[PDB]
Design an enzyme around this catalytic site. Structure first.
Site, PDB file in Angstrom:
ATOM      1  N   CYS A   1       0.844  -1.201   0.000  1.00 51.98           N
ATOM      2  CA  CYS A   1       0.000   0.000   0.000  1.00 51.98           C
ATOM      3  C   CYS A   1       0.873   1.243   0.000  1.00 51.98           C
ATOM      4  O   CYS A   1       2.082   1.154   0.183  1.00 51.98           O
ATOM      5  CB  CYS A   1      -0.938   0.025   1.219  1.00 51.98           C
ATOM      6  SG  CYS A   1      -0.130   0.519   2.764  1.00 51.98           S
TER       7      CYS A   1
ATOM      8  N   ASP B   1       2.964   2.146   3.217  1.00 51.11           N
ATOM      9  CA  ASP B   1       4.118   1.252   3.268  1.00 51.11           C
ATOM     10  C   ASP B   1       5.344   1.853   2.591  1.00 51.11           C
ATOM     11  O   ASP B   1       6.482   1.720   3.084  1.00 51.11           O
ATOM     12  CB  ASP B   1       3.787  -0.065   2.554  1.00 51.11           C
ATOM     13  CG  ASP B   1       3.009  -1.030   3.428  1.00 51.11           C
ATOM     14  OD1 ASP B   1       2.839  -0.743   4.621  1.00 51.11           O
ATOM     15  OD2 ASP B   1       2.581  -2.090   2.918  1.00 51.11           O
TER      16      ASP B   1
ATOM     17  N   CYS C   1      -4.616  -2.257   3.792  1.00 48.94           N
ATOM     18  CA  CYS C   1      -3.707  -1.983   2.672  1.00 48.94           C
ATOM     19  C   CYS C   1      -4.464  -1.694   1.369  1.00 48.94           C
ATOM     20  O   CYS C   1      -4.117  -0.763   0.652  1.00 48.94           O
ATOM     21  CB  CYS C   1      -2.693  -3.143   2.475  1.00 48.94           C
ATOM     22  SG  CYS C   1      -1.676  -3.550   3.893  1.00 48.94           S
TER      23      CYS C   1
HETATM   24 HG   LIG Z   1      -0.193  -1.542   4.199  1.00 48.32          HG
END
Ligand SMILES: [Hg+2]
Length: 204
Positions: free
Chosen positions: A92, A95, A155
């Protein structure tokens, strides 16, 4: 506009998990599959411990030989390109903003706006973001659900967008998402810094 709730819950869901996280990411960052025994050797842990922790992470990605290939940072293609000459991927958008400080490397990140498909890109170092294109890039956040699959519940709803208004138009059509919020990419990076500073204190 207060992001502590996202910081708090993210740590809840995500988190010796923290002790395992950083070493696994740095391994995965080498571009190859990581076995439980290699991981165990790196941590100075017995194998049962490594396995127990991984069993709590239901989104963990494995290859044909059962070695780790995905854990936030992944070798399997996603919408979030994470380049360090290696071409890796992230689960995601948030991240991509967090990982660089954890692995101590600068990353070239790219994706497409989730609302319009326009290309978006930036460079993320351990301390800042640069070459934000477009400048007005935005990020969506939802509140992580404590016991749920992290990749599906969090995510998959955490995207890059070409602009804040564009992102807000998109969010207006997406009810059902718990705590859905749009922030600037710079705000998202600040959130990631907070997350990391806390995470690191939790580490032994
Ligand atoms: Hg994530």
């Amino acid at each position: 506009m207060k992001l502590a709730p996202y910081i708090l819950e993210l740590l809840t869901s995500v988190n010796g998990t923290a002790d395992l996280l950083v070493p696994l990411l740095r391994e995965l960052a080498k571009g190859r599959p990581v076995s439980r025994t290699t991981l165990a050797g790196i941590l100075d842990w017995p194998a049962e411990r490594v396995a127990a922790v991984l069993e709590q992470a239901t989104s963990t990605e494995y290859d044909k030989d059962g070695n780790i290939i995905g854990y936030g940072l992944t070798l399997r293609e996603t919408s979030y390109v994470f380049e360090i000459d290696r071409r890796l991927y992230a689960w995601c958008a948030l991240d991509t903003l967090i990982f660089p400080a954890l692995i101590g490397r600068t990353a070239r990140v790219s994706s497409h706006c989730a609302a319009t498909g326009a290309p978006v890109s930036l460079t993320v170092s351990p301390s800042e973001i640069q070459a934000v294109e477009p400048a007005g890039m935005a990020v969506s956040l939802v509140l992580p659900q404590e016991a749920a699959d992290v990749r599906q519940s969090f995510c998959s709803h955490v995207h890059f967008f070409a602009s804040v208004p564009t992102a807000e138009d998109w969010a207006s059509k997406h009810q059902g998402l718990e705590g859905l919020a749009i922030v600037s990419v710079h705000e998202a990076f600040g959130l990631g810094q907070e997350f990391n500073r806390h995470l690191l204190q939790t580490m032994s």
